[PDB]
Amino acid sequence: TGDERFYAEHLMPTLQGLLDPESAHRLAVRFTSLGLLPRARFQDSDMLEVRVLGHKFRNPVGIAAGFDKHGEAVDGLYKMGFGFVEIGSVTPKPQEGNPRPRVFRLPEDQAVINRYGFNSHGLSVVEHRLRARQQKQAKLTEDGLPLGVNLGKNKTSVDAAEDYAEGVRVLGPLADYLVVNVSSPNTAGLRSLQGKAELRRLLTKVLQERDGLRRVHRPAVLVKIAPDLTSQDKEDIASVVKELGIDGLIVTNTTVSRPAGLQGALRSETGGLSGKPLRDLSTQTIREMYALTQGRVPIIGVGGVSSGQDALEKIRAGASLVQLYTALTFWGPPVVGKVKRELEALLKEQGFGGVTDAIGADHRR
Ligand SMILES: Cc1cc2nc3c(=O)[nH]c(=O)nc-3n(C[C@H](O)[C@H](O)[C@H](O)COP(=O)(O)O)c2cc1C
Ligand SMILES: CC(=O)Nc1ccc(-c2ccc(-c3ccccc3)cc2)cc1C(=O)O
Ligand SMILES: CCCCCCCCCC[N+](C)(C)[O-]
Ligand SMILES: O=C(O)c1cc(=O)[nH]c(=O)[nH]1
């Protein structure tokens, strides 16, 4: 029917009652890849346009990594209304991830816990999948609909930095921006790459490889961090980011914390928690990183965004763009248009000429 209320109150609840989360996810990717979606309707206004990372974004709402892990539904996602698409978290070689079940719903908390473990088709498969639509994407990007590629590492890799280096060389030429994901809570020792010494070495290699690509194929490089960092960790990341000239940060992957108050029966499953319970922890992390980097480093805010208010709070905290995933798993496609519509209304209501004017607003009051 293509209606917010119908999807949230009937279609989605029914779907989740018939299919486990991973099955619903696979089914969703299929329908999305085929463009079988409800009306978009919402028309992006000039107010939502953002210029950052060397690109124009029709609107600041993107689909976070993890929904389209292998780059199979990019075009369908733009059709859904996202201002930008970030694909997967691709590992050099293909790998299956953890055994099932590996993802769980916490309906009473509007949250999800996942421990997929980097299931990925691998760089080669994704490379050819993106090459098949490389020129179509070039036009989309020019039209204000950029593509991001999230890089991960193989479970059995003996050289983490080389895994990311490979990703930069293979998919960097096909992306507007690359994401060095060192914040997955489901890969042993991965988060330790967020440490100062280890991060500096890793990012120096990544940036060298990126700089070695032809200008037209030279993507911006961002680092995606966890919401569970100590104050010391954040200070160190900010320092390395400014020292190396990292282009941006994606703030907050899922959390390994289990906030008091979770009601879901599956709250104690191992994995990263996403959704509403993560929202403010992520917003506060965005706020801190913005201040530590003097507002000079673009931030993509993500974690628990399901409304215009959620989006604006992250923008005012310092995010230039935001992403969502879990909200889509509960409310369906209509949630994209809802967030954009509510965000536009709030911007006007609060006297902002547009999204750009609101970025980091809280720090100036
Ligand atoms: C099932 C699932 C799979 C995910 N896979 C990835 C991934 O491969 N790479 C990554 O950087 N983040 C991944 N994420 C994290 C999301 O990109 C995002 O940082 C986090 O879920 C917070 O946003 P949300 O509350 O809107 O879901 C995943 C999240 C979920 C729920
Ligand atoms: C862990 C995870 O990714 N879960 C999920 C991921 C996606 C979805 C989904 C998203 C979009 C539709 C859709 C698409 C086209 C037309 C109409 C509806 C359907 C299902 C549901 C879940 C879920 O847990 O239930
Ligand atoms: C992904 C399973 C959820 C089932 C709903 C599929 C909705 C079809 C939307 C109809 N349409 C393409 C015409 O807009
Ligand atoms: O593949 C996964 O398990 C995964 C990766 C990541 O970066 N974040 C997450 O929540 N899950």
UniProtKB/Swiss-Prot annotation:
Assigned EC number: 1.3.5.2
Gene3D superfamilies, A to Z: Aldolase class I
GO CC annotation terms, alphabetical: cytosol; mitochondrial inner membrane; mitochondrion; nucleoplasm
InterPro entries according to UniProt: Aldolase_TIM, DHO_dehydrogenase, Dihydroorotate_DH_2, Dihydroorotate_DH_cat, Dihydroorotate_DH_CS
GO BP of this protein: 'de novo' pyrimidine nucleobase biosynthetic process; 'de novo' UMP biosynthetic process; pyrimidine ribonucleotide biosynthetic process; UDP biosynthetic process
Membrane topology: Single-pass membrane protein
Cofactor requirement: FMN
GO terms, molecular function: dihydroorotase activity; dihydroorotate dehydrogenase (quinone) activity; dihydroorotate dehydrogenase activity
PTM notes: The uncleaved transit peptide is required for mitochondrial targeting and proper membrane integration.
Pathway: Pyrimidine metabolism; UMP biosynthesis via de novo pathway; orotate from (S)-dihydroorotate (quinone route): step 1/1
Pfam families in UniProt: DHO_dh
Localization, UniProt: Mitochondrion inner membrane
Residues binding substrate: 69, 114-118, 181-186, 253-254
Family, as annotated: Belongs to the dihydroorotate dehydrogenase family. Type 2 subfamily.
Other comment: The identification of DHODH defects as the cause of postaxial acrofacial dysostosis (POADS) was obtained via exome sequencing, demonstrating that this method is a powerful tool for identifying genes underlying rare Mendelian disorders. Exome sequencing consists of targeted resequencing of all protein-coding subsequences, which requires around 5% as much sequencing as a whole human genome.
Binding partners and assembly: Monomer.
Pathology noted in the entry: Postaxial acrofacial dysostosis: An autosomal recessive syndrome characterized by severe micrognathia, cleft lip and/or palate, hypoplasia or aplasia of the posterior elements of the limbs, coloboma of the eyelids and supernumerary nipples.
Name of the protein: Dihydroorotate dehydrogenase (quinone), mitochondrial
Organism field: Homo sapiens (Human)
Gene behind this protein: DHODH
